[PDB]
Design a protein around this ligand. Sequence first.
Ligand SMILES: O=c1ccn([C@H]2C[C@H](O)[C@@H](COP(=O)(O)NP(=O)(O)OP(=O)(O)O)O2)c(=O)[nH]1
Ligand SMILES: [Cl-]
Ligand SMILES: [Cl-]
Ligand SMILES: [Cl-]
Ligand SMILES: [Mn+2]
Ligand SMILES: [Mn+2]
Ligand SMILES: [Mn+2]
Ligand SMILES: [Mn+2]
Ligand code: NA
Ligand code: NA
Length: 326
Amino acid sequence: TLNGGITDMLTELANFEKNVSQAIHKYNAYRKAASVIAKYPHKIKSGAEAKKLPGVGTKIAEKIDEFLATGKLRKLEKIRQDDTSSSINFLTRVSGIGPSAARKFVDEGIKTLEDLRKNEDKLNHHQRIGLKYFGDFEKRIPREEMLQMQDIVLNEVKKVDSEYIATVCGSFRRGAESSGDMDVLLTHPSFTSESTKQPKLLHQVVEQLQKVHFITDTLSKGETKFMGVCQLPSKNDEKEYPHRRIDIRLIPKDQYYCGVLYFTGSDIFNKNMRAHALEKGFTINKYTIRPLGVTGVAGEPLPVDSEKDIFDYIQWKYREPKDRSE
DNA sequence: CCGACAGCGCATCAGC
DNA sequence: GCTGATGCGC
DNA sequence: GTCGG
Ligand SMILES: O=c1ccn([C@H]2C[C@H](O)[C@@H](COP(=O)(O)NP(=O)(O)OP(=O)(O)O)O2)c(=O)[nH]1
Ligand SMILES: [Cl-]
Ligand SMILES: [Cl-]
Ligand SMILES: [Cl-]
Ligand SMILES: [Mn+2]
Ligand SMILES: [Mn+2]
Ligand SMILES: [Mn+2]
Ligand SMILES: [Mn+2]
Ligand code: NA
Ligand code: NA
């Protein structure tokens, strides 16, 4: 809002760098500048003012000066005039179409959704599904729908085997009023880091959710990670619910609560607890928390039976998920 | 001046 | 066939 | 593109 013009500009530049230039570090640099500016509680008056913020450097400061002086950016104006770059950038909005497939499509004269529809035989399965649900995938999920999805997923999982444990993580678990997708973590007492005790633990769950027509499509599935599409059941001549993105991860239970911590997030809170965690000489990844030795050497992973256990190790107060914004 | 900027599972392709 | 690289989205 | 070593 306050510097929306600037941050829109930076976001536009980030998408260009990612999708057209294929320069993911520049993408992230621009994102990082836009994010720090978005949190700044003043109307930016000059580039030099902005350069004081971490993540804003000499070149963005110059771009901000030009934008403040003229109401636009020549670089971006020129990018908007480039139909080919605009098409490449647009196509990467299809899930499964990255910067490289987008460029390849456009070089073959495939430039719009309509072109994709008439060239399906050139899309892989992921891309076909991304195309099929192009609009739905960009829509957000209201919390009320998430609650319903949680209730379906948690109970259907237990019907396959009462000993399964599933947890809906991500922004939902942080109490967010809307979510972009559904992140499910799954475990079972038979699955531990050392051994596979049961076959097809993830496959049977996915099968069950297909059976009750909650899961409608699959982007990818292996022995530990499922990515696909789901949809709430529609009551009588009610409008259809949008198709939603769902991810299910099968985690060994001896690593389960480290996973839950990681995939609960947020983004900026994980680093805070990590960078911190080095305090007391502990290192934290998504699977484990290990002690750091006097020489810098990570020890064996400590036992974790709950999320609180992780907190008891680096000795901080258990933080409720709602409080993990940063 | 320089390389880091996360690293992984899965699908697909490259190169034998 | 095989193995390793790359593209992609987390 | 920006940062830190
Ligand atoms: O590449 C990743 C993947 C996951 N994570 C973490 C933190 C995060 O909050 C969580 C879920 O990843 P999402 O992409 O689903 N973001 P989130 O669920 O928090 O918000 P959204 O409603 O937009 O999905 O796991 C990362 O930090 N980086
Ligand atoms: Cl880059
Ligand atoms: Cl502009
Ligand atoms: Cl580990
Ligand atoms: Mn999520
Ligand atoms: Mn997600
Ligand atoms: Mn081949
Ligand atoms: Mn510097
Ligand atoms: Na700065
Ligand atoms: Na895409």
